[PDB]
Design an enzyme around this catalytic site. Structure first.
Site, PDB file in Angstrom:
ATOM      1  N   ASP A  93     -17.243  22.509 -14.329  1.00  0.00           N
ATOM      2  CA  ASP A  93     -18.335  21.572 -13.938  1.00  0.00           C
ATOM      3  C   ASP A  93     -19.664  22.269 -14.094  1.00  0.00           C
ATOM      4  O   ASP A  93     -19.871  23.401 -13.574  1.00  0.00           O
ATOM      5  CB  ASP A  93     -18.200  21.111 -12.486  1.00  0.00           C
ATOM      6  CG  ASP A  93     -17.065  20.155 -12.192  1.00  0.00           C
ATOM      7  OD1 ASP A  93     -16.328  19.776 -13.124  1.00  0.00           O
ATOM      8  OD2 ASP A  93     -16.985  19.764 -11.013  1.00  0.00           O
ATOM      9  N   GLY A 145     -15.478   8.412 -15.657  1.00  0.00           N
ATOM     10  CA  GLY A 145     -14.231   7.651 -15.623  1.00  0.00           C
ATOM     11  C   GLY A 145     -13.536   7.720 -16.960  1.00  0.00           C
ATOM     12  O   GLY A 145     -13.562   8.754 -17.606  1.00  0.00           O
ATOM     13  N   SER A 197     -19.873  13.421 -16.330  1.00  0.00           N
ATOM     14  CA  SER A 197     -18.701  13.288 -17.222  1.00  0.00           C
ATOM     15  C   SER A 197     -18.990  12.193 -18.247  1.00  0.00           C
ATOM     16  O   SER A 197     -20.031  12.276 -18.939  1.00  0.00           O
ATOM     17  CB  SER A 197     -17.456  13.026 -16.376  1.00  0.00           C
ATOM     18  OG  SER A 197     -17.379  14.022 -15.347  1.00  0.00           O
ATOM     19  N   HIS A 232     -18.643  18.233 -18.190  1.00  0.00           N
ATOM     20  CA  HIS A 232     -17.390  18.986 -18.003  1.00  0.00           C
ATOM     21  C   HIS A 232     -16.373  18.488 -19.013  1.00  0.00           C
ATOM     22  O   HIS A 232     -16.545  17.395 -19.550  1.00  0.00           O
ATOM     23  CB  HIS A 232     -16.930  18.959 -16.544  1.00  0.00           C
ATOM     24  CG  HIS A 232     -16.290  17.723 -16.044  1.00  0.00           C
ATOM     25  ND1 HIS A 232     -15.875  17.617 -14.711  1.00  0.00           N
ATOM     26  CD2 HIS A 232     -15.916  16.572 -16.623  1.00  0.00           C
ATOM     27  CE1 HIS A 232     -15.329  16.407 -14.511  1.00  0.00           C
ATOM     28  NE2 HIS A 232     -15.310  15.767 -15.673  1.00  0.00           N
TER      29      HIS A 232
END
Ligand SMILES: O=C1[C@H](Cc2ccc(O)cc2)N2C(=O)CCN(C(=O)NCc3ccccc3)[C@H]2CN1Cc1cccc2ccccc12
Ligand SMILES: O=C1[C@H](Cc2ccc(O)cc2)N2C(=O)CCN(C(=O)NCc3ccccc3)[C@H]2CN1Cc1cccc2ccccc12
Ligand SMILES: O=C1[C@H](Cc2ccc(O)cc2)N2C(=O)CCN(C(=O)NCc3ccccc3)[C@H]2CN1Cc1cccc2ccccc12
Ligand SMILES: O=C1[C@H](Cc2ccc(O)cc2)N2C(=O)CCN(C(=O)NCc3ccccc3)[C@H]2CN1Cc1cccc2ccccc12
Ligand SMILES: O=C1[C@H](Cc2ccc(O)cc2)N2C(=O)CCN(C(=O)NCc3ccccc3)[C@H]2CN1Cc1cccc2ccccc12
Ligand SMILES: O=C1[C@H](Cc2ccc(O)cc2)N2C(=O)CCN(C(=O)NCc3ccccc3)[C@H]2CN1Cc1cccc2ccccc12
Ligand SMILES: O=C1[C@H](Cc2ccc(O)cc2)N2C(=O)CCN(C(=O)NCc3ccccc3)[C@H]2CN1Cc1cccc2ccccc12
Ligand SMILES: O=C1[C@H](Cc2ccc(O)cc2)N2C(=O)CCN(C(=O)NCc3ccccc3)[C@H]2CN1Cc1cccc2ccccc12
Lengths: 178, 183, 183, 184, 186, 179, 179, 184, 180
Positions: free
Chosen positions: F159, F56, F85, F110
């Site tokens: 990714d 997020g 992430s 990523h």
């Protein structure tokens, strides 16, 4: 719409069809047709068929003023319904040449509108629609022989008339009997 | 909304110390709550000051008049304090505080303007709506003249369009008595 | 829209007689069409009058100026005739007709007011937008002063809010030269 | 969603408020400002001398709501420490700079962004003019206070806020928006 | 509707103007509009490689690549393309106004000309945003270089003057070098 | 959510914080508050941060990151389910030697995502900001993993899904917690 | 939800955990918290996991799976109504000899579902990831059922509905709990 | 909207009479069907005279693009390609597909090359089939672009990993076009 | 759509070329059936050319085209340009034997029919039986047109199966790749 399209074929015989709500587009078309018919023949009658629930007062006045401006008499014939600005235009036909068919409906009522914003903006809008009503009532008084006071009272709410009642009121001259 | 410990939400804890927070648009729900709080505080102590904090863009004129008339009705003085902004019916309520106890913090904004409304329908319905909002404006202007010491003619001119005042300008106008300066 | 056979739609038949119908809101499409009709009519006959019928609530100021400047550019006189209503940029174009050849029918409505717009974004972007609409208003008012014979100060006061005029009032004001009365 | 601590039962934010910590952790609107103003007034009433800690992780929001918080901070007697964690942008960075002199902090990876105020205007030319004049006067007021709080000139603040201007915590210290980076 | 004129042949009004070598750029610039305008320019060159073409501009601008399709076609063809601003020429519309044959760029007196930097957007990964940013900055450099050539203003001045929306009157556009003459009415 | 305390409040009593959703400002504000509260209760005892998150907001993630590094107690990190992430960034931010994953947990790294809209100069500002944010993330992940910034840049271009054992080899965690 | 405790909190007091919805991160976070809490209350006594679930997130399912295998108490699994997809995977994950279904319970097994949009290389990464996820699921299901990976691959190619008795024959459960 | 020329043709039909085909939109099946029809018609009118394909396109459907590509290669006349505005994605592929020595761009035209885009939803094995299909489609595009440009497949793969914008002069250097058409 | 002095498609139809360049629905099938019947009436001996660039569509609309092709006297050549998928690849295979073509970069895709059903168990059963019988009908005809066994067609259409033009020739869906 069958094939001239059927309305263009009627226009060749000096018949104009006001068969919808009155908005600027309809008024522009009817004004153009009236001016064209005057240019083709300044003496021969024009026939304005009215089946309309009414609509824009200013668009209606574009039609009204063009009728009064041109040289030919414009006969008005109510078929189905003439309501609100539609009944005003019915009453605007040449004196003695305003008609309705026997089961046609005529409805008269006061103008509708809106106002939004500051108190002073609402006041301007209110004064404008009240002046517009005074103008409509004065002309309808002249065209019908009814007093302004009577027209004001009779248009406070929706007022439906038969063809015979519209004749008694002075909105038309004759009921066209079969 | 945090809790303070008896267990109170923060606004209920301020109400215990006679502080009422008017921190939103004024609608009937907000007015019902503020009227209830004013009546409750009068019952708890009819003599002690009440403090009404105002950070509001305004809202319903009738809801604002529910608050206005309750302020004038009750016995305690209601101090008004503008923090952030008091606009439209919010600035009217700011000016309605006890004489000498109307305040703004230095960077607070006050805005005055004429009432807003709308009407759709028959000419006679539009006329009734117009006459009603014009009479409402006359009522607001008469009271603001009484509360500020400005003439009705000046208030009418100064509220024709949105009129933004600093706290110091609001004091000069008579909408508040003092700018509350920090120590 | 009916057809007349000599095949023309009714508006194309009027254009053959040098009548242009401005019968809607003014947007770029309407202005492009009317500019093209004016240039065509000048090419067909540089001497004979053109008749611009106006029943319009107004619209885009830049679209209106495309029509205005084309009217002033071409050699033929452009008569203007208000039927129904000419409001805002529509009343500006009505006033722009050849001197002595601006008309209204007796029950036509004319309305004048200041330009409308909007702006969203950074303070500096809002400042640019404000400066632009104020310059646009000054340009409109200066031309209306020239075309009516009223002072710029009077035009500014009279366009502050919506101002509705009868055909006779529009003549007295200098927005038209004559009310076209029926025989 | 928000956990409870029992010592009496507190949600975690109410437990921090007991230790004079106020969390400004969202966009600034009137509701958030009303809550933070109420918390500041409550903490002053509990103890007029002890510092208050205002945590800031905010993208900013309403300028008038931000000024409700700003003026309440300056009004009350206790020093209000400001601590930027995550991000302080727009009116959030203005409130960060508004903390007690010497007690404005950021954690090392916190982001500070300064920019000019945003708004809108719609209507008649004269209405647009009123709205434009108001937002320009609001910008002048923000820049004057930021000049006072940072030691930068009004002209420099005007230039540096013309577009979005992102600062590291160390750059925010060099600029005068904070006094120290709180190093671990 | 768009009216018809009869001369016998029947033309919509825009087709009648095209017969007299007038092209109307009267909308936002997108690929469809550029395809039409490029086709008209190529057609008019084929009809007469020597006679002037008249490009009417009333446009808020639009696609920079669609605008460059028109720009390069103007420069490629042999006839002079006169440009005439009526109403408004904004953004890529003002770029095309400035692209007309030297000495034959016009505006009518109340026409609005607006110049500003290009607009765009990007969403996705940091490296995708970097590619999009580099592309729009290179596009702005290309626009500014050509506008410097067409106006006689320095690239530095064009960069400063296009940072925000910059509204010019017709006379200001002439002073700037975006047009050669204001067509004042007789 | 059952009661015993709601179940999460009962775990917080035992110094366990659950990061079990997308990271936004609300989640970060709650976790920062819990970390400060636990430090105040006991400045010496370990804290346990459970991570099952798709990531997020980067700034919300840095609110959590800086609060972890600020406080005195060691914060153990445990990846259960997924850490992607900014979630994998926080997994790597745990006390050195006390970063764990369960055997079937997924770790994904990523580059940061964002957007930019408006004038060319506004897009340039947005691009420069997200590129500087990526440089900051890569520098810290280099410090926490022992991998070069150049390697992190290449490995996060698209990714990149890692098993728990691959995350250990990479230096994102110290141990796979085997049953 | 009635009160006695809400009814679910009352069951948790008797070491019963209800997995009665789609599996998402919120459900997994709650079940993981309940498992850790029950282990802390008593590390030796069995836990009972009721399963009525259409499945859901594979990573959320693996958060539950790994927590079951990590903790000391045996976790019995009981399928009532339906266990589909990741729900049938968790049913098979219960303590050996303590996986049950009631007689009219439905068990469905199938391959994992997902999606990918973007550049060819992004689609390739997404495809490789979901294929590796399927290999991981099939390897564990082979271990838990005694069926070959090849048979599990064939039997999960499309939706495969099993009765409770068929699930027992397959090795997904140990017994049908007959009334 | 589209003007008429009377000798009665819409402007595009008038250009087609002079063997000019105007590709000014996204490539979809409708656009491909029309361009294929125009190419076959022009071959039937005259199998020897050049055709001129103007390209201003952001690209679109790969299969629709291959309908155009294969029709160009099939017919006897040389098809000149001229990029005006932009040729991106399948648009740049078609630009490169013109007759050798007769591929052009105007000086401010943009060319963009990138890998194909698509999507897959469903079961793991369905996603695998979709992935294998788009990877094979990329191999097919890269092989043909290698043949048409003289660049290696390895270089095309690297250069199309992300959006790659070229000027007209860069497109010439790359081998996507033969000449930049400079104005007289 | 340009004009030639005819819209471009009407000009191609004058030379006995029919363009199937969209999804197959009843409107497309009605038009193509009408064109086939018209071309047979103009000349019962001369070949017709059916261009196919289609993702497929309605099976019954596809069978309207298929049966009209087999009914009429002229040979109908089929030419795949771009893509022939699903019912589009079925119609490609339906061309006159020896006159089914693809251009070299054309894509051919074969797969089982798609549909749906909602309502009572017995309504779902009727829908399932109908789509399974439709699949058997398609597979039987494709077996006849390709020379592949029904068993092989069933296996090869279980999921989306993409073929190159050369693979489509090897499969028996076309006779020749039209090389430039
Ligand atoms: O004011 C004129 C004068 C009126 C006129 C008409 C005939 C005369 O003998 C004298 C005055 N006017 C013209 O002077 C010439 C153009 N025009 C016409 O009415 N032309 C004839 C025509 C032929 C075919 C179609 C329509 C009209 C008209 C056009 N106009 C403006 C006009 C424009 C449009 C609608 C009108 C409705 C009522 C009055 C005037 C209108
Ligand atoms: O008219 C009465 C009187 C007013 C009153 C108040 C104090 C006095 O010393 C004399 C008259 N009235 C009562 O006579 C008794 C009930 N009441 C109170 O105000 N009661 C005290 C109370 C206790 C706790 C909470 C709120 C109020 C009130 C209730 N009301 C109606 C009322 C109801 C609601 C809001 C009002 C706001 C202003 C004035 C009256 C309001
Ligand atoms: O500037 C010209 C000059 C103006 C001109 C016209 C007549 C003259 O005697 C001298 C100058 N111009 C031309 O020089 C030739 C092309 N053109 C015409 O107006 N041609 C005649 C014509 C025939 C049929 C339909 C429309 C126009 C025009 C086209 N234009 C540009 C133009 C284009 C479009 C709208 C215009 C509106 C006002 C002024 C100019 C416009
Ligand atoms: O103006 C007063 C004065 C200020 C004051 C405070 C302390 C002093 O020693 C002197 C003056 N005022 C009062 O005079 C008494 C009520 N009040 C308090 O602050 N009360 C204490 C309190 C207890 C529990 C929660 C919150 C505050 C306050 C309430 N108010 C209005 C007020 C209302 C709401 C927010 C404010 C923010 C800044 C300044 C004043 C605010
Ligand atoms: O800067 C302070 C100092 C830090 C501190 C803590 C302990 C020390 O021994 C020294 C410095 N600070 C205080 O000085 C006192 C208030 N506060 C506490 O952490 N109080 C203890 C507490 C009890 C119950 C719940 C939460 C915290 C904290 C509050 N803050 C600001 C603050 C506010 C909110 C979150 C923070 C996260 C990291 C660092 C500071 C944060
Ligand atoms: O890694 C620990 C260790 C594991 C442990 C547990 C018991 C032992 O005897 C030894 C190691 N851990 C602790 O070291 C202490 C805090 N904790 C507990 O499980 N505490 C007991 C507890 C009491 C009340 C509610 C829930 C847990 C746990 C918390 N965790 C991290 C953790 C956090 C959240 C979920 C987990 C699921 C599986 C494994 C670890 C998880
Ligand atoms: O395969 C044929 C052959 C190709 C051919 C063309 C010319 C030759 O000399 C030999 C073979 N074919 C014909 O044999 C006759 C019908 N046809 C034509 O191309 N006819 C000429 C025509 C006239 C007017 C408009 C369009 C085409 C064509 C139609 N087709 C099928 C076809 C149909 C549609 C598009 C095609 C694109 C590329 C190749 C074939 C296509
Ligand atoms: O059944 C008939 C017969 C078939 C026929 C055709 C040729 C023959 O030599 C013998 C039988 N039938 C007719 O008997 C006469 C009307 N018709 C035609 O095909 N007429 C020729 C025609 C001329 C112009 C346009 C289209 C067809 C056709 C019309 N039909 C019905 C029909 C109608 C519509 C589509 C059809 C597709 C395939 C088969 C029959 C179809």
């Amino acid at each position: 719409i069958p094939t001239y399209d059927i309305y263009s074929r009627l226009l060749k015989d000096r018949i104009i069809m006001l068969g919808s709500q009155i908005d600027d587009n309809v008024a522009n078309s009817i004004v153009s047709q009236l001016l064209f018919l005057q240019a083709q023949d300044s003496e021969k009658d024009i026939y304005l068929y009215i089946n309309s629930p009414g609509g824009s007062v200013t668009a209606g006045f574009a039609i009204y003023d063009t009728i009064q401006h041109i040289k030919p008499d414009v006969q008005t014939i109510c078929i189905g319904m003439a309501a609100s600005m539609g009944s005003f235009l019915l009453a605007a036909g040449a004196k003695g040449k305003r008609f309705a068919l026997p089961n046609a409906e005529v409805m008269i009522h006061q103008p509708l509108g809106g106002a939004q914003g500051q108190a002073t903006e609402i006041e301007i809008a209110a004064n404008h629609i009240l002046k517009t009503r005074e103008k409509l009532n004065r002309i309808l008084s002249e065209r019908t022989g009814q007093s302004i006071e009577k027209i004001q009272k009779d248009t406070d709410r929706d007022n439906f008339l038969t063809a015979e009642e519209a004749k008694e009121y002075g909105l038309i001259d004759e009921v066209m009997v079969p």
